[model samples]
Target: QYSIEKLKKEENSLAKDYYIYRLLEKNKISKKDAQDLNSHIFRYIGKIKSELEKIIPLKPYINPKYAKCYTYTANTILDANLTCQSVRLNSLVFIASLNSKDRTTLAQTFKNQRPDLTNLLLAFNTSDPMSYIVQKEDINGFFKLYNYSKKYDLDLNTSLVNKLPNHIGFKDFAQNIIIKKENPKFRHSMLEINPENVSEDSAFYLGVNALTYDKTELAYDFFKKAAQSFKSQSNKDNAIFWMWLIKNNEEDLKTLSQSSSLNIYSLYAKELTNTPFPKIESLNPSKKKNNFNMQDPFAWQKINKQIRDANASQLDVLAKEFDTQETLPIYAYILERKNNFKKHYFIMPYYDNIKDYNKTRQALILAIARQESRFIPTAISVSYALGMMQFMPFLANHIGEKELKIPNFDQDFMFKPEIAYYFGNYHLNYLESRLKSPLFVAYAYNGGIGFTNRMLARNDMFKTGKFEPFLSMELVPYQESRIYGKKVLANYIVYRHLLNDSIKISDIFENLI
Candidate 1:
């Protein structure tokens, strides 16, 4: 009652109205009473002279010296500051508007007292960039800015955002020229990803990104650099895999094939020509030994709890230590569970079980679960999304037999692996006919169908109806959803290799759209 009425009165309210109403919409609470059965005072604001004094605290003048650097930021938001007017304003709202000079000045002044205030100003501009916003920050930083602006309803330049690479996609490399895909509709005339401008470490992924996006000539070069330049042997093989994928050059494939390495690309190439030495099949992946301690294999239920512990992200960390080369049937088995509601296997029985879904949709659904929660059944995000598929409770509850036609569904039902899988698959099915591309489905799934449609209609890259999936993925405004699209799609590729008994990326793309 207190915050609800108060929230309505304030202009600032995503944390209050959006949050409380979301809970109410989920049937969790219709009203949150301000009073409790017991009234206990935790603090003695000894200035309690009258009944009025109990409801309101006297406003004190903040010494200008306390925030001398942000003096303008205090008096006026870019249009008059909020915190200066009242303590009710989030310190963040005020601090976020400060410029680099003001931000640094405030930081040095407050040092230990308000670290978050100092840190955030680095992102939000004090004054609009004198140059293009793109020049002011890297693409990732802009993605963060876009996401923050959306969630907070702040103003960011949509036109400037359009000039940015739409997807920080692992596939951002495909937009580059040299051996590109045959789609005239695909236009990145505005984009040139000289990955060198970014860090050298992730350049390998950028090369595979080229391979992933159909920049064949670019991928070959990206991979050549990656093969020679990247530090990891595994990454080198990945580059070689792409080189072979594009050129089918026998030399690299032959080397990858003869190599004893069990990296998936090595296994992948080896499978293509390895013969009754045809190793991948009758290839008992579990027994194919190397290193990586499987020490004690875990039961499904026990491992599920660990994924449930979101704070200790080490759930993924803990399993990686034991994962190595081809000896990973145990490793894959363990990795499959957790936040996704169940690992790949547990969700498998239903891959073909849904009356309206297919192996393809199942692959996408599991990919989403894998990306969303890592198979953790009761997973909850900082945003309070529940279950393995990370459904915001509202959508979870809104779905059911009557709505999307999934049987026996409810928000809480999503917590079970089977339920999460069925509902997730059902949700994807609901979107398929209405949307285009697995790209659209993934974005709509993460960001919401309305957001997907609105962004597509307005975003410079996709609004032209150019059918640019790469650009579309990039321009997806929410950082969470944009990244979600990549991981889910990436997971789908691997699942197709492992369970769907498919290897062709074209087959996966054609099947999905």
Candidate 2:
């Protein structure tokens, strides 16, 4: 029914992918031709890639292009009898998809072909982790191995920890050992950690661990050292805040409140010091006006390019020109260029339609939008989370078809502020029905509902403790979701205040379930 030449001649990558998939499905193409086509076809197309994998012989040949594809789908292909050997192919098998058992099998199978023993050990879940860690000199392997050991409750040979390179994970490992009440192991791990060799994150966590053991002076020293090296103003502010916390230093807190960073810690410091939020500055109006086609990704890309190339004066002009409701995302980007984190930068766009929801829901929408896209209606993330609310295509399609009952729904609808808001609200309601807290909903939104559920079910989280909510927030395994939850929580608090229903961040954290 189809010719290979015609399919190859197909101009559109997506269309060609589907036609090729159909050919493969019906056995219209031969194995030889299928294997050749597999070498060049767009590997990112998941549907065709799956179909092609079904047809091609496991041992003969696959494109180097398919390495990334295989890496992502490693869990699915591990049992497919793929016997190919390349440094790329061998290495990708150890990606995060496979569990401990899958990793163990693959590690033994590809042990010789792997790039290094460290690469093999990173994926390999050994009973004696420190044996491998002590034997190897790789820093990355050290970090991942420590994480795996902690995750599976595997015992580490504390004496060998010093044999490993100095890494940011030392304090994390120290914290867990301290939690287990194994002071000897904690001391052994801490003995080799040089603050000079590690990052600010390591120093901050080490400070937290020091506080856990009532080493207040050591905690202050670590925090003070970490504060100087933190790359982001927000993070530096956090380290300073901790230093202030240890001693109740008003100057440190006041300095934190006045810093250029606008984040959870900075906002809290502001509230504590009774400092007024920076005034939202008005941009000078520009007479030049241009319309943006919301449906076209290129249009959004053009605006982004201009912002990327813009100088300070140009950004100021563009900021004023793009200050309308539809162009609010562009305006936000320009504000970022100016390093201005004023209240208007977080203004509630599409407020008239959004106001139809309850006050809590309204705050939730604003908070999610600000974090998801900075209110950019046509935003697309690296993973293809589309629009202002950043819904994945699969979830967006489901919401459109099943709930909205719209026939022939297009994903382009997600790029429209109104639809994105409505669809996001519908999805959020499902999450909220299960999770009552805004912070929890934020986690569910960025991560998934299942992840959030598993997170809450853990005994170590939200329990009665001296450091509570905040400490658990820092320790959560998924780093993206952890930071996302904090930023969204801060955004929600700010939005709630602007909406004339003020709530304290401390109150929300204290009452978290």
Candidate 3:
């Protein structure tokens, strides 16, 4: 009674396996029946796919006409291309085809005409095809690519390394091709040198990198050695802060929090112990304590003018010249206001908007923007996350179609603060409704839900009535999603304070599910 045509209508539409999954879940179909159906879906799509790829190939799909039909999350040949009518119908269908169990066979079918498809098939020859696409395509972006490793509780780095072109050495590609990004995780240029020729600076970098993967013990060893190496007490304080948190020794942190010489670390620690804000007078004669100086109005006006005119290159050079913390934020705010071409722009929202929406949804959007683009509307990541909220093209298209009700929106609209914000807020709200916790929502949003679903299932959270944020984060596996979870939570906490919310700083996640 249920044909693929009708069955596809009642599903998420973009997800490849959702309908088949729906058949299993709601229709009570047996696993064998579902596999056979899934196999049929693949055979059907692969046949249709042979005709579609003449128009759209792998290198930069510039056609906005076919944008709505694209998706990175395509798992089988049964999803979007099958459902959505489009120009490059087979572009997505081919990706979905690669995901099919009949994939290698399908590749063999296309061996003569489709060299691009064949190369893609070779790269995706793993048991898990999506993982290959996710890492190689720079889907996780820079944050997780360099920082995440085995210490995060999985050695996905090595597994991924094993799959790249074998002619080139692994770390050679890692240090060169694999790691290029808009904002690299390896911040300091000192990171380029070999690990054998270590120094205090390299140790600091290593310590931070280790902390990223939850390598606390080894991280501390590197941190403390560098801590002693640096003469400035403030320098020692960072390593000292790591020591306290990694060991879970709050008492020591409270003691250090009382130390004025530690600067922001002192401010952070003081807040931890419920000490009052403005713990000391402004760092300079400045009111906000090193935030900005009201004495120089002319420089402020000139800088904003550059941003207003969309002179990002001039603004970038000028932004670095300013010493105060105000410099970056001033650049960030105006960056949202300027519009050119198809990428739209808008008036800046009240920071108070962070609290205006679902009281259940306090600062999640702001926190994500802060983490994603640092409020820059024009910001793009190495993974091609466009606009302030950094939606991937595949994700933007899906959200643009199903949620926003615009089937053919350009990827350029992702640069518009208004368009990007609407899609981002809607996407976050959807994730939160499904996942329950902001923490889980963050993981699903940054890294695909596929990985998180695997994690949640592996730990038996849904079935066993289990909820494990710490262990869940530890086990989520993709260096990106595992670490992205904590930073967003931290950003949420900080934004709550900025918005004047009364959420307790400590144990703000006491009720985390």
Q: Estimate each model's TM-score.
A: 0.45, 0.70, 0.43
Candidate 2 local lDDT, 325-371, one digit each (tens): 56655776788776644334676766776888988789899999988
The residue pairs found clashing in candidate 2 are none
> What overall lDDT, based on C-alpha atoms, would model 3 receive against the true structure?
0.50
Please report, as a residue range, the 10-residue window in candidate 2 with the lowest summed lDDT: 84-93
* Span of ten consecutive residues with least summed lDDT in model 1: 36-45
Model 1 misses residue 296 by how many Å? 24
**Which runs in model 2 stand beyond 4 Å of their true positions?**
1-129, 132-188, 191-197, 209-217, 282-289, 311-317, 320-325, 340-344
The digit string of per-residue lDDT tens for model 1 on 1-513 reads 334444444332222333344434444432233232012222222211222233343466676644633454443533433344233123544555445576565545444664444334544544432123344435544444434442322222434334343556323332332123322222332123454333333444445345435566765665676677765565566567767766878998887766543344555566677422222222123344445322211222334345446343675674564354332333444454433422224233223334356556666776777667655555546465666677876677677645766665555566565677767776887887788566678889988899877776663535433223333443456667766776666566555555544555444334432
Model 2, clash count? 0
How does residue 413 of candidate 3 score in lDDT?
A: 71
Best by TM-score: 2
